[PDB]
């Protein structure tokens, strides 16, 4: 199924690059942190113009009018008022760089999991069954671009856990058995592709008493002339 | 209409959104129309006119400022000389006339300051001196939007209806879609005991 | 069959800032306007804390597109999830074993509602155990595709190395040992054991916070009275100046100090509930090969079960 | 929180006043000028006077909201109000319903039957 294949794939990054370059706005998460970012350095600019109980907000107008004696006791309101804020920047700052590291490490992980190799563990690297990724640069992030394999077109079958012939259970080596109304197959079991039931496709295991739900068919022997 | 609006002070301010806090003329408040009572000066006016009829003004509660009109100024004592808006303030012994004529419509346009008589008179009421509204100030809180050149362009009346209360919280014209925590209520006593 | 209990979410709160430091004063709000926007820092993050704390639940619990329906017919080889299965004669969708779990477990400061209900968290679950049950982990990747229940077992045990005719040949000793270990969790926990202390601990630390945030009120930080209505009919406003004053800078260290360990907090439930997620979608909707990731011994199946702000896991 | 009448020597209790918040719900002002209003868990019979009063008032549990009409669809959630209640803009008005989970799907299950995919995307 190559071409078909090559295809779907060709399709689908076209559609990536349609979805971005139409305006539905898709790097929110990035935009948050330099929102959030910008908004705390405001507020600590805003906050120099506060009197904090002191006769003036500016300091060159208290140093300007007042004496030694009594000018200290309104610089020390504004120190106090600006150390306090100064605190609470700080704070705040090393609690959000705590967050934005541990988002850094789920990327590093998913640069070594999902990028130099294929992953088995469900929905990190996706939805469906990975194949592959392919990372692309953003403004302090990064985007991932995650291939799969999904499923398509269901059908409905018959089926049984095992197969008697000869007094003997018969058990597949790798797929199930169907059945499409009258002839019964072997069958891999993410893709529908029938073929006769051998000995060479299935293992044998004691009787045929044991196995709830065991069907009588015939197990086909390939060195038949001799 | 979004009339009555003048500059609150005399900083330049450049592509800002400045939050003031002044008496304002509410947006969509009923002006009288007059076509001369003596009517009464309550804590600020607004007035205009729509030739030649309109002279000046008599103020004061009954010493009672005069402006007629070879502008001339009587205030029983000092004497000065030096669509049309005008706006009255009588604040801490000053007098301020905010003024602005223009060639009542929906444009928007601010009143710039025109001159201050420090003279520290009571005043209850006024009359004109032969088309003319009188409005009246509140105590408000604009949202003022200046642009490239340093002019008044924009307001939004923080009092006026919900959304205006978001765009003060949000300080912006444009509001995105959400819900916003804008104020508290709680009900006031009603006597004492 | 074993059990691990999760915490996911925690109480959404809001403080009123200006009635908390003066309520009903307006001497008192008027001085604090003198400190800059301190009270909207402090609005403003407790609100993201709030917000926070619905996401968590929805990464959490909505990781199905269907809300998917166990058949009538309860015939699964032998095996019985009568007790994790939900019961609608009691009016809840809320199964046995749930109802044992959530059985065990103003000044300016409301509680918010969060945005999902109880019965909601309960429908979610149902979906990703009727999923389950009748299609293995094909819903996880598409569309379900549905298949009996022991062919489904036999090949989790071919997963785990084992040879399919194993199951196929002791399944009715299969299905009873499973039914027995599901009895066993549900006496325990019907039992008195301190089992969810987790989740009772998230409780216990934040009623601390808010009970000594009240009791901070009744310091006087050196003024003359702790009560503000005292102070002003005792004194002229010159003199009241200096002990409100007093009062407003122990307030607003209380505040500060509360909302700087909410931050903290907050923090850590985050991780818990994205260890939640990935717990979600690595044990419920698929079969693990991490060591200890899914429980102790070979995994071949897990369950989800809901709690008060909290998740529980079965594991097989 | 009680007291005794100095004068009539009266056991009467002491209650605060109503103190909720407010929040106000909107749509983007690129699309519409109408807004609803939330009041914090006071029962709407305690409540500006076109958004204080009138028609469209629904008690949640949540609180009071007026200026919303209530319907009795399932939609996704646009704009969370809490415990299930969602808004959202839809002549045009504003709505308030039931938040959905999803679609309602059962799968054909019975002890001998199976599906097998046919064919396949790439994602
Ligand atoms: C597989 O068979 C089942 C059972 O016949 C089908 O499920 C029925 O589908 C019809 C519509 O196609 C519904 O009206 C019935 O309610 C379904 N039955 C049950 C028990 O749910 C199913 O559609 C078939 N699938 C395929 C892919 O053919
Ligand atoms: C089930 O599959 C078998 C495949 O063997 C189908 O049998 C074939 O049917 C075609 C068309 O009638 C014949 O040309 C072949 O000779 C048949 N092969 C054999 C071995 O008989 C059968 O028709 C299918 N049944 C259903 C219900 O689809
Ligand atoms: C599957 O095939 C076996 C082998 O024939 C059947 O078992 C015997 O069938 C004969 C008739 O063919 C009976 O006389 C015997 O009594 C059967 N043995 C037993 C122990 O009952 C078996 O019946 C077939 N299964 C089905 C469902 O037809
Ligand atoms: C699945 O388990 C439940 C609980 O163990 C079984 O329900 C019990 O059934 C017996 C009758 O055999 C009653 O005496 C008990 O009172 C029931 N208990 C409860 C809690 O309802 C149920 O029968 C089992 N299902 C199957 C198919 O065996
Ligand atoms: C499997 O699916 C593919 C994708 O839909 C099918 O390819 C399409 O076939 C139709 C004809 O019915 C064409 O009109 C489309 O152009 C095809 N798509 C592409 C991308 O080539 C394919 O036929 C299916 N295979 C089977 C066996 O049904
Ligand atoms: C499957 O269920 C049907 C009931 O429709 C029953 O007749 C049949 O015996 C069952 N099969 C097995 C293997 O138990
Ligand atoms: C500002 O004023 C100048 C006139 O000197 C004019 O050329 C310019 O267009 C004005 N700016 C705007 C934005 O209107
Ligand atoms: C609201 O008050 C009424 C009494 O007028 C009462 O019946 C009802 O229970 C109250 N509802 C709530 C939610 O408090
Ligand atoms: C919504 O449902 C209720 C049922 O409790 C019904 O009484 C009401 O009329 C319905 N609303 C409309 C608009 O039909």
Not at chain 3, 252 to 258: N, P
Not at chain 4, 57 to 64: D, L, N
């Given at each position: 199924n190559?071409?078909l294949?090559?295809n779907?794939f060709?399709?689908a990054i076209g559609?990536?690059?349609?979805s ?9 998460k ?13 507020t600590?600019?805003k ?11 500016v300091?060159?107008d208290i140093?300007s009018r007042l004496?030694?004696?009594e000018?200290?006791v309104q610089?020390?309101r ?5 150390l306090q804020?100064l605190?609470?920047?700080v704070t705040?700052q090393?609690?959000?760089?705590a967050?934005?590291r ?11 999991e ?15 069954y ?7 640069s953003?403004p302090?992030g990064?985007?991932?671009?995650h291939?799969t394999y ?6 409905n079958?018959?089926?049984?856990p095992?197969?008697?012939?000869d007094?003997?259970a018969?058990?597949?080596?790798e ?8 002839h019964?197959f072997?069958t891999?079991r ?11 496709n299935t ?5 045929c008493?044991?196995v ?6 015939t197990?086909?022997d390939?060195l038949?002339?001799? | 209409?979004?009339?009555g609006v003048?500059?609150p ?6 592509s800002?959104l ?9 947006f969509?408040?009923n002006?009288?129309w007059?076509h ?11 007035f205009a006119?729509?030739?030649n009829?309109?002279?000046?003004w008599?103020f004061?509660?009954?010493?009672s ?10 205030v029983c004592?000092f004497?000065?000389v ?6 009255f303030k009588?604040?801490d012994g ?10 009542l ?5 601010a009143?710039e300051?025109l001159?201050?008589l ?5 005043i209850?009421?006024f009359?004109?001196?032969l088309?003319?509204?009188v409005?009246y ?7 003022l ?13 923080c ?6 209360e978001?765009?003060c ?6 509001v995105?879609?959400?819900i ?13 005991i | 069959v074993?059990?691990?209990?999760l915490?996911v ?5 809001s403080?009123?800032?200006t009635?908390?430091?003066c309520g009903?004063?307006?001497?008192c709000s ?9 009270c909207?820092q402090?609005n ?16 959490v ?7 998917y329906?166990?058949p009538?017919?309860?015939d699964?080889?032998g095996f019985?999830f009568?007790?994790?299965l939900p019961?609608?004669?009691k ?9 044992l779990?959530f059985?065990?477990?103003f000044?300016?400061?409301?509680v918010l509602?969060?945005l999902?209900?109880?019965e909601?968290?309960?429908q979610?679950?149902?979906?990703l155990l ?5 299609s293995?982990?094909?819903?996880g990747?598409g ?7 022991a ?12 040879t ?12 009873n ?11 325990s926990?019907?039992?008195?054991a301190?089992?969810?202390?987790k989740?009772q ?11 000594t945030?009240v009791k901070?009120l ?6 003359i009275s702790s009560?503000?209505?005292?102070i002003?009919?005792r ?6 100046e200096?002990?409100?004053?007093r ?21 850590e439930?985050?991780?818990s509930?994205?260890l939640?997620?990935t ?9 693990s090969?991490?060591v200890?990731?899914c ?11 809901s ?5 529980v896991?079965?594991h097989? | 929180?009680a ?6 020597l009266?056991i009467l ?8 918040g407010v ?11 109408q807004?609803?209003?939330?009041y914090?868990?006071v029962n709407?019979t305690?409540?500006?006077?076109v958004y204080?009063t009138g028609?469209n ?8 909201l007026?200026?919303?009409?209530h ?6 959630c646009?704009?969370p109000?809490?415990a299930?209640?969602?808004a959202?803009?839809?002549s045009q008005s504003?709505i308030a319903?039931?938040?959905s ?7 054909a299950?019975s002890?001998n039957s199976?599906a097998?995919?046919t064919?396949?995307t790439?994602?």
């Open positions: 190559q071409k294949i090559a779907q060709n399709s559609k990536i690059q349609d971005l370059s139409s305006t539905a706005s898709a790097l929110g990035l935009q948050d942190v330099v929102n959030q970012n910008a908004q705390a350095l405001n600590l600019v906050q120099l113009s506060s009197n904090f109980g002191a006769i003036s907000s300091l060159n140093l004496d030694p004696p000018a200290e610089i020390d504004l120190i106090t008022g600006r804020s605190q609470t920047y705040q090393l609690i959000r760089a967050e934005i541990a988002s850094a490490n789920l990327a590093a992980t998913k640069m070594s999902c990028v130099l190799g294929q992953s088995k563990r469900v929905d990190f690297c996706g939805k469906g990975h194949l592959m990724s392919f990372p692309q953003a302090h990064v985007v991932f671009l291939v999904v499923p398509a077109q269901e059908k079958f018959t089926t049984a095992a197969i008697c012939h007094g003997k018969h058990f597949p080596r797929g199930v058995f169907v059945s499409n109304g009258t019964w072997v891999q993410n893709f529908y592709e029938p073929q006769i039931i051998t000995t060479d293992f044998v295991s004691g009787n008493d044991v709830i739900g065991i069907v009588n068919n197990v086909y390939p038949q002339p001799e | 209409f979004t009339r003048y500059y002070d005399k900083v330049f301010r450049s800002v400045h939050s003031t806090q002044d008496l304002f003329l509410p969509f408040s002006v009288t007059f001369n009572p003596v009517l009464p000066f309550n804590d600020g006016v607004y006119s729509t030739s009829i309109i002279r000046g008599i004061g509660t009954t010493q400022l005069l402006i007629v009109n070879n502008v001339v100024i009587k004592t004497e000065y030096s669509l049309r808006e005008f706006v009588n604040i000053y007098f301020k006339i905010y003024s602005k004529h223009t060639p419509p929906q444009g928007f346009s009143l300051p001159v201050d420090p003279i520290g008179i009571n209850t009421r009359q004109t001196l088309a003319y509204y409005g100030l509140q105590p408000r809180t604009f949202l939007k200046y642009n490239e050149n340093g002019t008044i362009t924009d307001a939004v009346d009092a006026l209806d919900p959304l205006s978001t765009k919280t949000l300080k912006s014209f444009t995105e879609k959400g916003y925590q804008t104020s508290n209520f709680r009900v006031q006593p009603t006597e004492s | 074993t059990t691990e209990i915490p979410s925690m109480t959404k709160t403080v009123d800032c009635m908390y430091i009903d004063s307006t001497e008027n001085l604090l306007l003198q400190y800059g926007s301190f909207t402090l403003r993050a407790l609100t993201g804390i709030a917000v926070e704390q619905d996401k968590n639940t929805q990464e619990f909505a990781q199905v597109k269907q809300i329906k166990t009538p017919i309860k699964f080889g019985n009568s007790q994790i019961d609608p004669s009016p809840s969708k809320r199964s046995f074993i749930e109802d779990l059985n065990k477990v000044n300016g400061l409301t509602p969060p999902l209900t109880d909601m968290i309960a979610y679950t149902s979906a009727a999923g389950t049950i009748t293995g982990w094909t819903f990747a569309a379900a595709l549905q298949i009996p229940f062919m489904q077992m036999a090949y989790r045990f071919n997963g785990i190395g084992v399919q005719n194993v199951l196929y040949e002791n399944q009715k000793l299969i299905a040992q499973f039914n027995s270990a599901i009895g066993k969790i549900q006496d926990l019907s039992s008195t301190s089992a969810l202390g989740l601990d998230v409780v216990n630390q934040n009623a601390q916070a808010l009970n945030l901070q009744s310091s006087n930080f050196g003024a009560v503000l209505n005292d002003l009919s004194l002229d406003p010159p003199e009241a200096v002990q409100i004053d009062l407003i800078t122990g307030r607003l260290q209380s505040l500060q100090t509360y909302v700087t360990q909410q931050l903290i907090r907050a923090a439930i985050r991780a509930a994205n939640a997620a717990k979600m979608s690595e044990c419920v909707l698929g079969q090969k991490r200890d990731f429980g102790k011994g070979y995994h071949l199946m897990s369950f989800p079960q709690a008060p702000h909290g998740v896991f079965l097989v | 929180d007291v005794r009448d100095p004068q009539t009266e209790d002491i209650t605060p006043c109503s103190f909720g929040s106000v719900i909107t749509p983007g002002t690129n699309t519409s000028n807004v609803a209003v939330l914090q868990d709407c305690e409540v500006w006077r204080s028609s008032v629904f008690q949640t549990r949540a609180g009071c007026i200026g919303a009409e319907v009795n669809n399932s939609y996704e646009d704009i109000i809490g299930g209640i969602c959202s803009y839809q504003i319903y039931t938040m989970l999803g679609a309602e799907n059962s799968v299950y002890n199976i097998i995919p064919n396949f790439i994602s």
